[PDB]
Coordinates of C-alpha atoms and ligand atoms in Angstrom, one line a residue:
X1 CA 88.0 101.7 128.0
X2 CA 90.4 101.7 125.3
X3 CA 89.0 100.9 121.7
X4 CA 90.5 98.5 119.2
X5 CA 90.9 98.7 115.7
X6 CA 91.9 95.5 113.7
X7 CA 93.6 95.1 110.5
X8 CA 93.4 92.5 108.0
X9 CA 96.1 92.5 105.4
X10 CA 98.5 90.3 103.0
X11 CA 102.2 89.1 105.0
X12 CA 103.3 92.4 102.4
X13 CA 101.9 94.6 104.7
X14 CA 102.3 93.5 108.2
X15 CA 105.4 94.7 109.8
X16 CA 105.2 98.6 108.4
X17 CA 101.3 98.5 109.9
X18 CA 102.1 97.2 113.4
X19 CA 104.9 99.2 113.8
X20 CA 102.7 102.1 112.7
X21 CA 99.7 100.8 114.7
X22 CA 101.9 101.2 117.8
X23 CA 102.9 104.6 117.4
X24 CA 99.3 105.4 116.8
X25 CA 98.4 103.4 119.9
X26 CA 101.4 105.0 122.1
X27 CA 100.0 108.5 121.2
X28 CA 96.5 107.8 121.3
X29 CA 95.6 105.2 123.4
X30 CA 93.4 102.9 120.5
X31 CA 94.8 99.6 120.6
X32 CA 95.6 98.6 117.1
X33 CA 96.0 94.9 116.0
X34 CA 97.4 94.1 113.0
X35 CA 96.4 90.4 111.6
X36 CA 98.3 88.4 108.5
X37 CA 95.4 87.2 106.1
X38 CA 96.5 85.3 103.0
X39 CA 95.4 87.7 100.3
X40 CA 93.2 85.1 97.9
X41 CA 91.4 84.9 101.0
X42 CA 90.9 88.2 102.2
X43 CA 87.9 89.1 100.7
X44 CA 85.7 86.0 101.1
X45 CA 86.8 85.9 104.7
X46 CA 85.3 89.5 104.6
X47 CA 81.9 88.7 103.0
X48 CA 81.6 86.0 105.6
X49 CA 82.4 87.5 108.4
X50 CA 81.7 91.3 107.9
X51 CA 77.5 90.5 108.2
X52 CA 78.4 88.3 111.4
X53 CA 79.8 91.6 113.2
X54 CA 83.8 89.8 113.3
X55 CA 85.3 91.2 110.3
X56 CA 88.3 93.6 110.7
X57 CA 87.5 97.1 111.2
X58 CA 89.9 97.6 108.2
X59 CA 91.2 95.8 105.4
X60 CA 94.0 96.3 102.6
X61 CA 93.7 95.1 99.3
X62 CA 92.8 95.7 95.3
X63 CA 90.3 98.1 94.1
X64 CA 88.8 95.4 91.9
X65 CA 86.9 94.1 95.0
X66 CA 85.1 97.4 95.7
X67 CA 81.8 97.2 93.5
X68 CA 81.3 93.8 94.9
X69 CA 81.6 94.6 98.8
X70 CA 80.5 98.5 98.1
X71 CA 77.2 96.8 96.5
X72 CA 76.4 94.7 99.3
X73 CA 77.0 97.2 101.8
X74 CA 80.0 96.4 103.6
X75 CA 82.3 98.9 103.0
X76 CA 82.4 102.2 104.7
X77 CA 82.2 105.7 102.2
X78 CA 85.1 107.6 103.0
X79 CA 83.8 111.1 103.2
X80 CA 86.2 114.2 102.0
X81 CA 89.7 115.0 104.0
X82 CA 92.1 117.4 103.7
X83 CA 94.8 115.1 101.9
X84 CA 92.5 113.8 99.5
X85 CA 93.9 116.3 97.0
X86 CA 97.3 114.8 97.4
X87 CA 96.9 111.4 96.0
X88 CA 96.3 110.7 92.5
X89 CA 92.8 110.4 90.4
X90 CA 93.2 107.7 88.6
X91 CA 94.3 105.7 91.7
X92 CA 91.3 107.7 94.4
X93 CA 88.9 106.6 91.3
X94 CA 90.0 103.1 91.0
X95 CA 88.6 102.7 94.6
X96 CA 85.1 104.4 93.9
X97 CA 82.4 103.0 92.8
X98 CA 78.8 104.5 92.4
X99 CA 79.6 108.1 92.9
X100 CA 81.1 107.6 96.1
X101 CA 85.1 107.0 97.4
X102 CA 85.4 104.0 99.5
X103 CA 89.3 103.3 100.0
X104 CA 92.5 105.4 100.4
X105 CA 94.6 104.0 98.1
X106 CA 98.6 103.8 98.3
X107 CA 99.7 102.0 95.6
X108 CA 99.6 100.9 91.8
X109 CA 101.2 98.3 90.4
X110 CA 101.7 95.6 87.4
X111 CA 103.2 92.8 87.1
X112 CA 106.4 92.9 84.6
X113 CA 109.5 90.7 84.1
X114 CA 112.1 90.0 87.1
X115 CA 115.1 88.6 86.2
X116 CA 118.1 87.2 87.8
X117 CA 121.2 89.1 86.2
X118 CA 123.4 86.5 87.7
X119 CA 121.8 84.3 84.4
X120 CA 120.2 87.0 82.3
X121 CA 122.7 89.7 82.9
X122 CA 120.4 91.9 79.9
X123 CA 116.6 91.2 79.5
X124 CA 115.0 89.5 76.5
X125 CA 113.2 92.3 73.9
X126 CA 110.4 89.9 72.7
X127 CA 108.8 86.4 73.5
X128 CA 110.8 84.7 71.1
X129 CA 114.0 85.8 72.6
X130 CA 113.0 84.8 76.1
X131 CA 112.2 81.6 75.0
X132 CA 115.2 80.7 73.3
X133 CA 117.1 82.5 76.8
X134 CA 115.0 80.1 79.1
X135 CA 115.5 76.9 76.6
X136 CA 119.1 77.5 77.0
X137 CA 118.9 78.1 81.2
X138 CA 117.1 74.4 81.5
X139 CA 119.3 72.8 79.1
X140 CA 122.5 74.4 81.0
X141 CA 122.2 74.0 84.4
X142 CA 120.3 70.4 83.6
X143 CA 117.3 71.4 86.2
X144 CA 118.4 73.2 89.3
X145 CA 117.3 76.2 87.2
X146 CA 114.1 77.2 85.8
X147 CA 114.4 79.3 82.7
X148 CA 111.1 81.3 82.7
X149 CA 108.3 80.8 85.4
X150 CA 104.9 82.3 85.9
X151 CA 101.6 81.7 87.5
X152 CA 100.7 79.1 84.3
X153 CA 96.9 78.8 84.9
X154 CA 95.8 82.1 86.6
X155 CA 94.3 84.2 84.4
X156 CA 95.6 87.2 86.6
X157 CA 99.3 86.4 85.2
X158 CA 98.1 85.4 81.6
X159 CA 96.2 88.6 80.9
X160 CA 99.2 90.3 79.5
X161 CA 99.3 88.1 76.8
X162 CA 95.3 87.8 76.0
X163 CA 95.1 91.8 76.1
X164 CA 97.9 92.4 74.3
X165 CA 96.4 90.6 71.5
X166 CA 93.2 92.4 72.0
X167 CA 91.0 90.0 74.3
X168 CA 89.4 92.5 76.6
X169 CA 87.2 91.6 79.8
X170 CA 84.1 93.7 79.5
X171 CA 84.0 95.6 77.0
X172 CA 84.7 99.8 77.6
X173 CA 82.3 102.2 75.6
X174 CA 81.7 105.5 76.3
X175 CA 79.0 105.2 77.9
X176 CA 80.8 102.8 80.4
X177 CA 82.0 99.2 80.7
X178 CA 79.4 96.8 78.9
X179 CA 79.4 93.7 80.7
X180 CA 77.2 92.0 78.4
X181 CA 79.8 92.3 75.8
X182 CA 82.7 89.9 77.4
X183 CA 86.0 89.4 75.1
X184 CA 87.8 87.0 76.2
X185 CA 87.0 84.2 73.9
X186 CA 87.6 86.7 70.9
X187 CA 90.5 86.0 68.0
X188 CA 93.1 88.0 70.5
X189 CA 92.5 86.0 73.9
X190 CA 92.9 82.6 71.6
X191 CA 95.9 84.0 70.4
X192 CA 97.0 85.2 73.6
X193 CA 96.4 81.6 75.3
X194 CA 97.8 79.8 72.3
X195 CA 101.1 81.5 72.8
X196 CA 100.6 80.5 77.2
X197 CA 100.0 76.8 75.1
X198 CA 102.9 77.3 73.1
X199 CA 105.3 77.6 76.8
X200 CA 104.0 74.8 77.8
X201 CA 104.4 72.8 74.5
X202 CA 107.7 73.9 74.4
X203 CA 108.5 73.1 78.0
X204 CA 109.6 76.6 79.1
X205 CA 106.5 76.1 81.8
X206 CA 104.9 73.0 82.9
X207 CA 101.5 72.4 84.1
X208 CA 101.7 72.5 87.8
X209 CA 103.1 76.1 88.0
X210 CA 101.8 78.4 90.3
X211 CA 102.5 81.3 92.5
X212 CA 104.0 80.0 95.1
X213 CA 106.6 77.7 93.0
X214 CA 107.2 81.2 90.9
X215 CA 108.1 83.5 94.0
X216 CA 109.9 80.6 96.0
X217 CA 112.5 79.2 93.5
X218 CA 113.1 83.1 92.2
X219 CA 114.0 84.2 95.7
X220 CA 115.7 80.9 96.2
X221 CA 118.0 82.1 92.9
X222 CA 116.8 78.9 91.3
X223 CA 115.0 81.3 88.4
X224 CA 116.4 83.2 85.7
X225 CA 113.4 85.1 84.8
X226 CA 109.3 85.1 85.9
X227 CA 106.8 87.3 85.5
X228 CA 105.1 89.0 89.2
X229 CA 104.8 92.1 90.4
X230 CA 106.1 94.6 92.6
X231 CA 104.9 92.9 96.2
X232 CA 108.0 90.7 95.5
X233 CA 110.8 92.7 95.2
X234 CA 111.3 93.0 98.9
X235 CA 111.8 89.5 99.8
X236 CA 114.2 88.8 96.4
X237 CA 115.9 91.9 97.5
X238 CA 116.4 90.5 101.2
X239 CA 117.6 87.0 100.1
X240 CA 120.3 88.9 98.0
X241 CA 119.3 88.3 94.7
X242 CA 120.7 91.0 91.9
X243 CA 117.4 91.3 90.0
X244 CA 115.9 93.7 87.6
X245 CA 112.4 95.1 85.9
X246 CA 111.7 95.2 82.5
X247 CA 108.3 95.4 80.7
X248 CA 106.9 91.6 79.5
X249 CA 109.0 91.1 76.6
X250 CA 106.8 92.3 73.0
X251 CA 104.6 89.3 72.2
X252 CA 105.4 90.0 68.6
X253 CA 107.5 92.6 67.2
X254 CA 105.7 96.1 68.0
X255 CA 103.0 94.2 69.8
X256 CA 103.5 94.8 73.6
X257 CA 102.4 92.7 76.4
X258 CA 99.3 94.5 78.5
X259 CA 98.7 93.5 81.8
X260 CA 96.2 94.4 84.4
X261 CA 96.9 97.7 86.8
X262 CA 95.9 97.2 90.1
X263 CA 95.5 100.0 92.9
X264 CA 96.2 98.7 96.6
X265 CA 94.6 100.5 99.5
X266 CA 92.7 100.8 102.9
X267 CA 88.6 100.1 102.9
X268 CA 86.8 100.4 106.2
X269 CA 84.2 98.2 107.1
X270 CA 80.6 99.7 107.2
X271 CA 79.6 97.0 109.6
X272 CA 82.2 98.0 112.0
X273 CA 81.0 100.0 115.3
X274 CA 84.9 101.3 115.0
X275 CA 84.2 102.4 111.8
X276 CA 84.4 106.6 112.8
X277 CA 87.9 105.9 114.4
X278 CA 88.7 103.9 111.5
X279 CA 88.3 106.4 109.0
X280 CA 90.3 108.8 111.1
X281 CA 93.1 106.2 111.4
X282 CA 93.1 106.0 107.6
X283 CA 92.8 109.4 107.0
X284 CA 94.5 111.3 109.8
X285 CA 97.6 109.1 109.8
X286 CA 98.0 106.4 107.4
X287 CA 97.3 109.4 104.1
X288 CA 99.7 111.5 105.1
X289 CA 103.3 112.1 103.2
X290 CA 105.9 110.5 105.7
X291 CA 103.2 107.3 106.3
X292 CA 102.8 106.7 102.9
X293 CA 106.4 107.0 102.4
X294 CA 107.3 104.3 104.9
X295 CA 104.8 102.1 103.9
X296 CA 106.3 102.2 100.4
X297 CA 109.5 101.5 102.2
X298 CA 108.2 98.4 103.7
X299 CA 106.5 97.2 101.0
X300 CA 107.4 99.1 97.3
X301 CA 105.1 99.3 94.6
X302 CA 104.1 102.5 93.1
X303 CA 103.0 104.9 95.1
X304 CA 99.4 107.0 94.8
X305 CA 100.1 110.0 96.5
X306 CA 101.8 112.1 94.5
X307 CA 104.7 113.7 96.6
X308 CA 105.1 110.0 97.6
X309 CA 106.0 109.1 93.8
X310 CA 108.1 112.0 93.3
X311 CA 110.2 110.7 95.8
X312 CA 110.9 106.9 94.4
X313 CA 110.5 108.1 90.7
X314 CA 114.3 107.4 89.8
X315 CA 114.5 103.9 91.5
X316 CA 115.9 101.5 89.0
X317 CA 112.3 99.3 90.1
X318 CA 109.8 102.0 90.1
X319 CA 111.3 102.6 86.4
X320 CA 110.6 98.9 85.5
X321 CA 107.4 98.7 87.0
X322 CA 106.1 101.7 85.5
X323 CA 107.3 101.1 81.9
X324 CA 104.9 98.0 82.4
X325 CA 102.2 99.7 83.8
X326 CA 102.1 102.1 81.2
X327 CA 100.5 99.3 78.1
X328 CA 98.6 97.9 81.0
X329 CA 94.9 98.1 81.9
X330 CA 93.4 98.7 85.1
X331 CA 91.2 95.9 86.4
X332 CA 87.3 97.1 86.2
X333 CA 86.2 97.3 89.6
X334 CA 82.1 96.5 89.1
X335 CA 80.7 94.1 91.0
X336 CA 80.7 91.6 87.6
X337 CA 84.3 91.6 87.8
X338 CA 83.8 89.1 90.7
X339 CA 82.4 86.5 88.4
X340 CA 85.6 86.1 86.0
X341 CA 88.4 85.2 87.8
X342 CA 87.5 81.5 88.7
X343 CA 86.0 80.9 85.4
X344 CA 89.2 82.2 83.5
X345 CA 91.5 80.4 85.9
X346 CA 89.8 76.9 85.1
X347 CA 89.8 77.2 81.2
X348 CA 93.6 78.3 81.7
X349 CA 94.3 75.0 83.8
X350 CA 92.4 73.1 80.9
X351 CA 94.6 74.5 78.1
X352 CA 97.7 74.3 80.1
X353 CA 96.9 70.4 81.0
X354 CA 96.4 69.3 77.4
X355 CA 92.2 69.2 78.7
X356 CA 91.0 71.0 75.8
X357 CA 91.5 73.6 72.9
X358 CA 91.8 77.1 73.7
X359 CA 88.9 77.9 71.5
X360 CA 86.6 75.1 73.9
X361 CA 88.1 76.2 77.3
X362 CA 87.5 80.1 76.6
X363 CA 84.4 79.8 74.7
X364 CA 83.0 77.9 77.8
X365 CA 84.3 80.2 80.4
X366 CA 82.8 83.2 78.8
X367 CA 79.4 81.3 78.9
X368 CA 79.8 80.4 82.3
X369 CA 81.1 83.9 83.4
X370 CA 77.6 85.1 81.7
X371 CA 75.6 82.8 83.2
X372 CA 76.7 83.7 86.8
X373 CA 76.4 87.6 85.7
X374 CA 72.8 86.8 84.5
Ligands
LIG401 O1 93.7 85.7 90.5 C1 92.4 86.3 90.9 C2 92.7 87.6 91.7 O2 93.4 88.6 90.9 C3 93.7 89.8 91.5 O3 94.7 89.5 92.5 C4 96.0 89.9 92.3 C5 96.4 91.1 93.1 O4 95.6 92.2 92.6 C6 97.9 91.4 93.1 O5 98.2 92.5 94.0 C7 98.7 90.2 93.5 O6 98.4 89.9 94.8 C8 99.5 89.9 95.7 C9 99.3 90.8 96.9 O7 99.2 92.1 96.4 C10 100.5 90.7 97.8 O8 100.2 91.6 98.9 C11 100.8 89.3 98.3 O9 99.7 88.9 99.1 O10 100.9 88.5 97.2 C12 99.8 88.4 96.3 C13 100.1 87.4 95.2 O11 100.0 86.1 95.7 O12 98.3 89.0 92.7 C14 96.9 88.7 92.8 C15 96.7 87.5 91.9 O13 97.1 86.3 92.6 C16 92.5 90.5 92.1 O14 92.9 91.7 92.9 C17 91.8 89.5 93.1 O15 90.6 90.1 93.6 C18 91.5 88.2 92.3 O16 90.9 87.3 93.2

């Protein structure tokens, strides 16, 4: 009787999988099903589902989730294999947790600025220059372009600006991350949300922008510039948009932007009785040079195994995405981190709906994010 192993995954991933699930399945014989998940709903889905024995036997996603899911059991430990040498550290450490590896990892990433050359031919150096440049883009095409867009109240696509003026999440000590000591209600973070405040009040974002409204009218060529990452590139590519990648303009002269790093990979679910085949999928297959390769071809970021880098490392993109990357901060993956993001997101949707100060909003969030943590 043939075996199954099912995927859960972003619509990012889903072509390069199946068609690599089929190959696996022609040689092999496991049948391998590859299923779209919206990401922001990946991981509950998991948490739910996972203990009921119906949770994919695999899923892809950040490394900021594996404290959380490796704490309550539900992802597999991926023991030693002969590639493990061939991907990077940093990116192999970003999904352990505890002493132990628990995902194979095939990409980093950060989010930086895209822009449409066909209005912003060369890329604004600071804030205040890409604010004049989108003032300008509203005032000139009267509305059927958007100057600047970004994900306004998701702390996610904010954090560039509250770490670059030194707000910090928990903070990192030698001896570790102390997540009694939370900074994102500290001088830098109100800075950092003051100037998100300061878009809005200047109308270069309004209130109700989100994600979807971002991506959409950029790869509709209805935006001269937003701030996303590398998952998106594809689809502007595909829609025949003539984009580039630059770093988040300086927030003040020498002052860069830092946004989060995130590592994508493969975790295997503990719960699974697939869970053996799983890993051998992942780590027979999926880690090797021309798989990671392709999957990079289907869906570019910036690749974690090394001889896998080495061979994007002069696309124009790569560059971009990198320069970014490189004042950025990788996301702490403990299982606290789990307890931010909500909190965060609501005091951003205060601020950017004229609800309350950005003192009130992030004060309040970092009590509430240290309520849930104690
Ligand atoms: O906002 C809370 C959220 O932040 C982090 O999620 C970000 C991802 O790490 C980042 O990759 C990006 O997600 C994209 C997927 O990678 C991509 O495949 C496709 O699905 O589009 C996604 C963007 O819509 O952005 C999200 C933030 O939205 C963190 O990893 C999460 O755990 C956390 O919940």
């Amino acid at each position: 009787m043939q075996p199954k192993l099912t995927i859960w995954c972003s619509e990012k991933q889903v072509d390069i999988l199946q068609k690599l699930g089929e190959e696996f399945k022609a040689k092999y014989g496991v049948e391998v099903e590859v299923q779209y998940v919206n990401f922001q709903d990946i991981k509950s889905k998991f948490l739910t589902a996972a203990p009921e024995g119906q949770g994919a036997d695999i899923i892809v996603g950040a490394h900021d989730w594996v404290g959380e899911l490796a704490v309550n059991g539900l992802i597999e430990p991926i023991p030693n294999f002969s590639d493990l040498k061939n991907f990077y550290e940093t990116a192999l450490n970003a999904f352990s947790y505890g002493g132990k590896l628990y995902g194979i990892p095939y990409a980093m990433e950060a989010i930086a600025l895209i822009y449409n050359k066909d209005y912003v031919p060369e890329p604004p150096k600071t804030m205040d220059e890409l604010i004049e440049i989108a003032k300008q883009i509203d005032e000139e095409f009267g509305g059927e372009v958007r100057g600047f867009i970004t994900s306004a109240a998701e702390f996610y696509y904010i954090a560039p600006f509250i770490f670059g003026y030194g707000g910090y999440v928990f903070k990192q000590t030698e001896k570790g991350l102390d997540v009694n000591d939370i900074g994102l209600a500290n001088e830098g973070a109100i800075k950092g949300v003051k100037l998100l405040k300061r878009l809005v009040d200047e109308g270069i974002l309004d209130p109700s922008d989100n994600y979807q409204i971002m991506d959409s009218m950029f790869r509709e060529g209805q935006a001269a510039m937003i701030i996303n990452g590398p998952w998106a590139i594809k689809a502007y590519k595909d829609a025949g948009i003539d984009y580039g990648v630059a770093p988040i303009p300086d927030l003040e002269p020498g002052v860069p932007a830092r946004p989060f790093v995130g590592v994508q990979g493969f975790m295997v679910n503990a719960k699974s009785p697939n869970k053996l085949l799983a890993i051998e999928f992942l780590t027979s297959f999926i880690a090797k040079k021309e798989t990671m390769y392709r999957i990079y071809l289907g869906d570019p970021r910036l690749p974690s195994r090394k001889d896998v880098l080495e061979l994007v490392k002069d696309n124009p993109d790569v560059v971009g995405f990198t320069l970014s990357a490189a004042n950025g901060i990788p996301m702490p993956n403990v299982p606290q981190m789990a307890a931010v993001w909500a909190a965060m997101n609501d005091a951003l949707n205060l601020v950017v709906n004229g609800k309350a100060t950005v003192e009130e909003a992030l004060k309040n969030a970092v009590e509430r994010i240290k309520a849930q943590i104690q």
